[PDB]
Homo-oligomer: A and B are copies of this chain.
Amino acid sequence: RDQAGITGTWYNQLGSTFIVTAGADGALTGTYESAVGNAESRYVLTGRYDSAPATDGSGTALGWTVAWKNNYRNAHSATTWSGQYVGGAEARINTQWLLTYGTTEANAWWSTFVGHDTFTKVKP
């Protein structure tokens, strides 16, 4: 339903690139390249979306994860984005995210960052 719509190349307000393919079964797979932080080149992402959403004008729920390890860098961290795809003229993926990095137990209290990313198909 929203498979073709979600599938494609997305950019957030930071200039990050999210290249994703939505599967018929609810899979999300692709690559993420962050414009910020301890990150270089593309990282693997996987996630899930609701492949049969409400038809009442509601968005499509989805989420995905990046672990920040590739051949170039390892930031000992993972980000999860949770949010919704909104179709139509101004297609957009509005998210909140959590970034956890590996800490000792004594440091676990400041292990997790929160933020928000909005993605569109136009590079801003």
- Residues of A at the B interface (CB closer than 8 Å) are 14, 25-28, 36-37, 44-54, 56-69, 74, 76-84, 86, 94-106, 108-116
- Report B-chain residues with C-beta under 8 Å of the C-beta of A44: 25-27, 48
- Report B-chain residues with C-beta under 8 Å of the C-beta of A58: 76, 102-104
- Stoichiometry (number of copies): 4
Q: Please state if A101 and B61 are interface contacts (CB–CB under 8 Å).
A: yes
Q: Please state if A69 and B52 are interface contacts (CB–CB under 8 Å).
A: yes
A101 to B112, CA, bound (A): 14
Closest to A114 in B: B114
Q: Please state if B77 and A50 are interface contacts (CB–CB under 8 Å).
A: yes
- Report B-chain residues with C-beta under 8 Å of the C-beta of A63: 65-67, 78-80, 98, 100
